[PDB]
Design a protein around this ligand. Sequence first.
Ligand code: HEM
Ligand code: HEM
Ligand code: HEM
Ligand code: HEM
Lengths: 146, 146, 141, 141
Amino acid sequence: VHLTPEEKSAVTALWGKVNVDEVGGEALGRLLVVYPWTQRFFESFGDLSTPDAVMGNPKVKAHGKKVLGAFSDGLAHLDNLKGTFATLSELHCDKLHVDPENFRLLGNVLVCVLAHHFGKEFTPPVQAAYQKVVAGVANALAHKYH
Amino acid sequence: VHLTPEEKSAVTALWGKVNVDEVGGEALGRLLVVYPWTQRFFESFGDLSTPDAVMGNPKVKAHGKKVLGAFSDGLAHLDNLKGTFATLSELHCDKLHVDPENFRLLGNVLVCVLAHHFGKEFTPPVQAAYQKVVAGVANALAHKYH
Amino acid sequence: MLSPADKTNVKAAWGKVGAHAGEYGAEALERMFLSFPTTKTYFPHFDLSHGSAQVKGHGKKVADALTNAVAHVDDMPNALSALSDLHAHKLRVDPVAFKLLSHCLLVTLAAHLPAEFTPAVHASLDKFLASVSTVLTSKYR
Amino acid sequence: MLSPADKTNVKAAWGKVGAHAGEYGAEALERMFLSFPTTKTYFPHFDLSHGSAQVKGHGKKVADALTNAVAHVDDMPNALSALSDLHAHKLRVDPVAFKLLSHCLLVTLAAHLPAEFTPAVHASLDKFLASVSTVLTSKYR
Ligand code: HEM
Ligand code: HEM
Ligand code: HEM
Ligand code: HEM
């Protein structure tokens, strides 16, 4: 999306240091604990009664990796989030019945997790470039809903 | 604004029956009464303590006609809302300091007002087309914010 | 927080709906589904075509609950407790969706009450629907 | 509503905030202004550049009202009555903007309190900021 070059490169460089497995595991898990109603799509993951259980759930952890995996491949197509995520958008609407407001919740969780992990390095200007990316990603994922 | 030509004709057709001066005053008045925090922008308009004070206020009425006259002109340019509203966008941001969430609140109130005026004529699909229009107009008015 | 005046305006407006509640509930639902298609993700098991019977049936159920809240406007958290458990623990609808339905019920009411949908009343009904939404969402976490 | 676990979680995290509260308040504002530029519409009278004194000063005021809320966590409406009056009748800030500041505060805490910002504490802080926000918008209409 409307991303400044100095912005574009702030994102990219930061992402190069991200452990996608850990981070995805943590974003998704935080999502299920901070906003419990999102657990409605995960009944078959198992016990999700307590934060600990949610955070130790291998299917959560594994699903977290998949999601962020797909997100990660997206930061390489910033000039075209819509095309990259179109099939995903359809599947989310037509097979999975996921309200896109959930994509926004995850993005905000994602931004808290990046801050948790990188501390001082996650500066306000670096946070701004990520907020653009995350909203851009959410909007791409909601694009094919009818 | 992605609008179907059947949507576009539904919208333009209804709009042809609108008395903009009156609907404009009603929409603005109801905005100020239903969402009283929005009065913050209108201290110079005098008395706004009761609904009749607001609805009959000659300044609210004049200002309403002016808002809607400009919304109208925008309905003749659905393919270039951004362009049409560029200067007004700048003006609302740098001189008036109006938070864009106000354009969306006003949008929703306009839709109930049209609903009030046209009754059954305001069909579910006709409403759906107006919802896209007010959203697009609100995004065009926010687009030069920085 | 509803005021005496709000409570009066709401009872007066809902009194006029009367035995129209269900009808207007279905209509509200149909407006929402067309205006805000993402809300369809909550009823994947329904048939959402115009005049659909599951939509009518659900519309009546929604309108009955609103009718009950009006009948119990000074005790809404308790009158709506069961419904509130259901939404928080089973249906888990995202909170923003309540705002969408609320707008649509308001549109539906406006289209049917040309005489009673005054600014004062519109205001009161908007606060009323936000209080109902707050109650139904109060046990989410 | 905040549970006992929540109050405790909140008091503990804000416990380690200690004397950086003012610095974190300021940081959160700066984060909000940059990420959500529309929020600048509420501070046309301020110099909003990096490290300006109006932001700092303001940051300390906000942080201090949060200190006061946590300490009166059992009695917020009363503890924040005056601030509630102030926002509803004078500042008249749009309710949606409270969500933005809250998110920026949360990011600010996650950035400065790594060991403390566990998934449970994150949940509680979010509920708390929401409760505060509700209280600050409870008299709007
Ligand atoms: C950052 C935005 C997101 C991205 C990029 C993403 C990506 C993906 C991908 C790649 C899959 C695998 C589909 C396949 O089998 O090929 C998937 C599945 C799924 N996603 Fe998303 N996802 C996102 C957010 C969400 C969130 C917010 C929710 C709900 C809380 C959600 C719910 C699901 C569900 C329920 C599945 C199917 C899981 C299963 O097979 O059991 N997703 N997602
Ligand atoms: C459809 C959305 C809107 C449109 C098309 C619109 C259009 C206009 C126009 C044409 C003007 C006159 C410009 C000038 O004086 O040079 C104006 C001024 C103004 N607008 Fe907007 N307006 C919109 C919404 C709003 C709303 C929602 C608010 C606040 C709730 C607002 C606040 C103002 C204020 C305070 C003025 C200046 C009043 C004065 O002259 O003292 N506007 N707008
Ligand atoms: C004005 C606010 C609302 C009220 C008063 C309300 C009331 C009700 C009632 C009475 C039921 C029936 C439960 C039973 O079987 O006894 C129900 C179920 C349901 N509601 Fe809510 N509702 C509201 C808003 C929402 C909205 C916003 C959503 C999502 C957009 C929603 C989604 C659902 C779903 C999916 C069911 C189950 C449908 C079925 O499978 O039969 N409701 N609601
Ligand atoms: C976490 C919720 C918030 C709390 C606790 C809070 C607290 C405060 C406090 C303590 C003051 C100072 C009052 C005084 O000087 O006596 C204040 C003023 C103010 N706040 Fe709120 N605030 C919150 C959110 C917001 C929101 C989100 C905004 C707008 C985006 C906002 C805009 C303002 C403005 C413009 C002032 C006046 C500043 C000045 O003119 O010096 N506040 N707030």
